[PDB]
C-alpha cells in the first residue's frame with residue numbers, strides 16, 4: 070500500500086495514511102490520541118516551515134555573506150534599531166500572529182475575519198492550511214503539495230539540527246563544513262573526530278566560546294549537550 | 300535427521316530434519332520455541348558464512364603475503380598501500396552505514412518474510428525467496444540453485460560449522476602462539492613434540508591494549524595467562 | 527504462566543497480574559490489604575519517578591564532571607549551588623516544602639477521595655486533576671502528549687517500562703549512595719575505574735565492602 074518508513078512493517082493503528090506525510094512512523098505512539106495528534110500535526114507544520122525558511126536563510130547567508138557566521142550572526146549585525154526595539158517589534162507582532170494561529174487551533178472556524186478591514190476574510194479551510202491571502206498561485210494539486218511541504222520540512226528540520234551541531238563541533242558554516250568534508254571525506258566525519266571506547270571517551274571540542282559579550286552583558290552561549298557528546 | 304550426532308541419543312521433537320544439517324543435537328534446548336529456532340538458524344547462517352569468509356581471508360592473506368599478521372592486520376599501519384595509515388574513523392563510518400543498510404534489510408526479511416525482496420530504487424527487479432536466509436537471485440548469479448537445494452544447503456552449513464570451529468581455532472592459535480594458521484602448522488611440523496597446545500596454553504601474545512590513531516582498545520584474550 | 531521473581535514459587539493471592547511490574551515479590555506480605563497495596567503502589571511509583579529523575583541527574587552531572595566541564599559531583603552539588611549563587615538554603619528548602627506540600631497534599635487527598643481535586647476548587651481546573659488510576663493521574667497537565675489515551679496496550683507496556691526503569695533507578699541511586707560511602711568518588715569515576723581494570727578494581731577490592739579481605 071502506502072510507502073512506509075520500514076517497507077515490511079505494519080503501521081500503528083492510529084496511522085491509517087489519511088494525513089499528508091503519514092509514512093507510518095509513530096513507534097512511541099505519540100499520535101495515538103486523536104486530540105493531541107492535531108496539535109502535533111500543527112506543530113510539525115510550523116516546525117517544518119520555520120526550519121525550511123531557517124535553512125534557506127543560513128544557506129543564502131553563507132553564500133552572499135560568508136564573512137559572517139550564522140551562529141554568531143546575532144551579535145554581528147549591529148542594527149541602528151536597537152537590540153531591544155527589535156525584540157519589542159518581533160515579540161508583539163509574533164504574539165499577534167501566533168495567538169491568531171492558536172485561536173485557529175482552539176476554535177477552527179473562529180479567526181478568519183480581517184479585524185481592521187471588515188470586507189476580507191479567509192474561506193473555511195482546514196486546521197494548519199489557511200489558504201486565501203496566504204496562498205495564491207498553487208502550482209498543482211493540494212495533497213501532493215502538502216506531502217512535498219512536509220517532506221522538505223522534515224528534511225529541513227534535520228538539516229537545521231545538523232547545521233547547529235556542525236557549527237558547534239567545527240565552528241564553520243554549513244557550506245564551509247561541507248567543503249571541509251569534500252576536502253577530506255575520511256578524516257572530517259563525526260566518526261573521525263570522536264570515539265568512545267570502554268576505557269576512553271574522545272569528545273570533540275566545540276569552537277563556540279562559552280559566552281559572548283554583546284554590549285555590556287554576558288550572553289551564555291553553550292554548546293548544545295556537550296558532555297553527552299561522543 | 301538420519302544418522303544423529305551420537306548413536307545412543309534421540310532427536311528432539313522440534314528437529315525432524317526439516318532444516319539443513321540437522322543431526323538433532325540441541326542439548327541446551329534453545330530451539331524449543333519455533334521463533335527462537337528461526338532466529339538461531341538465521342544467526343547460524345550468518346556466523347557460518349562470515350566464518351567461511353573469515354578463514355578464507357586469513358588463509359588467502361597468509362599464503363599470498365605471509366609477512367602480515369592477520370591478528371594485527373586491522374591496524375592502519377598494516378593496511379595495504381592505498382589505505383596505509385588511513386583514518387579509521389571514516390572507514391568505520393563507511394562500514395557502519397553500508398552494513399546497517401543491508402543488515403536492517405536482512406532483519407526485515409526475518410520479521411516480514413517477503414517484504415524487502417524488492418529493489419527500493421529501481422522498482423522492477425525483485426529477489427525470490429525459497430526460504431528465509433537463502434535469497435538467491437542477484438546473490439546467486441551463477442545459478443547453482445534450482446537443483447538439489449537441500450543438499451547444497453547441507454554442504455553450506457556443514458562447511459560453515461567447520462569454518463566456525465576453524466576460525467576460533469585460528470584466533471586461539473594466534474593468541475597462544477602469536478602466528479598464523481599455516482604458520483602454526485609449519486611450526487608444528489617443525490617440532491611436533493615440543494611445539495603444540497602443550498606449553499602454549501598459558502601464554503597470550505596479545506598485548507593489554509593498542510594505540511590505533513589515539514584510542515586505546517582494551518585488546519583482551521579468550522583466557523588468562525601471561526598478560 | 528507468568529514471570530515470577532523466584533521461579534517455582536507461586537505468587538501470593540493479592541498479587542494478581544493486574545499491576546504493572548507484578549512479579550509476585552511480597553515475601554513479607556506487606557501489600558496484603560488492598561488499600562495498603564494501593565498506597566504502596568503510589569509509593570513505589572513516586573519513589574521510582576523521583577529516583578529516575580535523580581539517577582538521570584546524577585548520571586548527567588557525572589558525565590559533565592568526567593569530561594572536564596565545570597560540574598560538581600552529586601555529593602557536592604548542593605554546596606556548590608547555594609554558594610556559587612547567593613542562595614539561602616533555609617529559604618529554598620521551605621519554598622520547596624511549600625510547593626511540594628501543595629502538590630503532594632493534592633495527590634494525597636486524591637488518594638483518599640479519588641473524585642476530588644477536580645471540583646474546580648483549585649483555579650477552575652477540573653479535568654487536569656481528575657486522575658485516571660491510582661498513581662497515574664493523566665490529564666492535560668501530567669500527560670500533555672496523551673500517551674495514556676489512544677492505545678491501551680501501549681499504555682500497559684509503558685506502565686511496565688515505567689515501573690521497571692523505576693525499580694532499576696532506585697537500585698541505581700542506592701548504588702550511588704553505597705559507592706560514595708565506599709569509594710568516596712563519583713559514580714562514573716567508579717565506572718571508569720572498573721572499565722580500566724575490571725579485575726582488581728571492584729567492590730571486592732575496596733577494603734570496606736568485604737571486611738574479611
Ligand code: CLA
Pocket residue numbers: 119122123125126127129130133134137142143145146
Ligand atoms: C527563520 C528565519 C530567519 C531568521 C530568523 C533570519 C535571521 C537573520 N538573517 Mg536570514 N534569511 C532567511 C531567514 C531568516 N533569517 C531567509 C529565508 C533568507 C532568504 C531570503 C535569508 C537571507 C538573509 C541574508 C542575505 C542575510 C540574512 C541576515 C540575517 C540576520 C539579520 C536579518 C536582517 O537584517 O533583516 C532585517 C529586516 C528586514 C530585511 C525586514 C524583513 C523583510 C520583510 C519585511 C519581509 C518579512 C515578512 C515576510 C512576509 C516573511 C514572513 C514569513 C516568515 C515565516 C519567513 C539575522 C541573523 C543578514 C545577516 O547575516 O546579517 C548581517 C544577511 O546578510 N538573512
Ligand code: CLA
Pocket residue numbers: 304314318319320321322323324325328329330331336339340341342343346460461463464465467468
Ligand atoms: C553461533 C553459532 C551457531 C548458531 C547460532 C547455531 C544454531 C543452531 N544450530 Mg548449529 N552448530 C554450530 C554453530 C551454531 N549453530 C557449530 C559451530 C557447530 C559444530 C560444532 C554446529 C553444529 C550443529 C548441529 C550438528 C546441529 C546444529 C543445530 C542448530 C540449531 C538448533 C540448536 C539450537 O537451538 O541452538 C541455538 C544456538 C545458539 C543460540 C548459540 C549458542 C552459543 C553458545 C552460547 C556458546 C557456544 C559454546 C562454545 C563457546 C562453543 C565453543 C567454540 C569452539 C570453536 C572452541 C540452531 C539453528 C541443529 C539443527 O540443524 O537443527 C535445526 C543440529 O542438528 N548445529
Ligand code: CLA
Pocket residue numbers: 694697698700701702704705708709716717719720727728729730732735
Ligand atoms: C543498578 C545497578 C548497579 C550497577 C550497574 C553497578 C555498577 C558498579 N558498581 Mg555498584 N552498587 C549497586 C548497584 C549497581 N552498581 C548497589 C545496589 C549497591 C549497594 C549494594 C552497590 C554498591 C557498590 C559498591 C560498594 C561498589 C560498587 C562498585 C561498582 C562497580 C564495579 C562492580 C562491583 O564492584 O560490584 C558491585 C555489584 C553489585 C553490588 C551488584 C549489583 C546490584 C544488584 C544486582 C542489585 C540487587 C538488588 C536485588 C535485585 C534486590 C535485593 C533484595 C534481596 C536482598 C531480598 C560498577 C561501576 C564498586 C566500585 O566502585 O568499583 C570501583 C564498589 O566498590 N557498587
Ligand SMILES: CC(/C=C/C=C(C)/C=C/[C@@]12O[C@]1(C)C[C@@H](O)CC2(C)C)=C\C=C\C=C(C)\C=C\C=C(C)\C=C\[C@@]12O[C@]1(C)C[C@@H](O)CC2(C)C
Pocket residue numbers: 324325326327328329345346347349350351352353354355356357368369370371372373463464466467
Ligand atoms: C562469525 C565468525 C568469524 C568471522 C570472521 C571474520 C569475518 C574474520 C575476519 C578477519 O579474519 C580476517 C578475514 C582477516 C583479519 O586480518 C581481519 C579479520 C576481521 C579479523 C566466527 C564464529 C564463530 C562461532 C562459533 C565458534 C560458534 C560455535 C557455536 C556452537 C558450538 C554452538 C553450540 C550450541 O548451540 C548449539 C549448536 C546447540 C546447543 O543446544 C548447545 C550449544 C553447545 C550451546
Ligand SMILES: CC(/C=C/C=C(C)/C=C/[C@@]12O[C@]1(C)C[C@@H](O)CC2(C)C)=C\C=C\C=C(C)\C=C\C=C(C)\C=C\[C@@]12O[C@]1(C)C[C@@H](O)CC2(C)C
Pocket residue numbers: 551552553554555556573574576577579580581583584599600601602603604696697699700
Ligand atoms: C532502594 C529503594 C527501595 C528499595 C526497596 C526494596 C528493596 C523493597 C523491598 C521489599 O518491599 C518489597 C518490595 C516487598 C516486601 O515484601 C519485601 C521487601 C524486601 C521489604 C528506594 C530508593 C529510592 C531512591 C530515591 C527516591 C532517590 C531519589 C534521588 C534523588 C531525588 C536524587 C537527587 C540528587 O542526586 C541528585 C539528582 C543531584 C544531587 O546534587 C542532589 C540530590 C538530591 C542528592
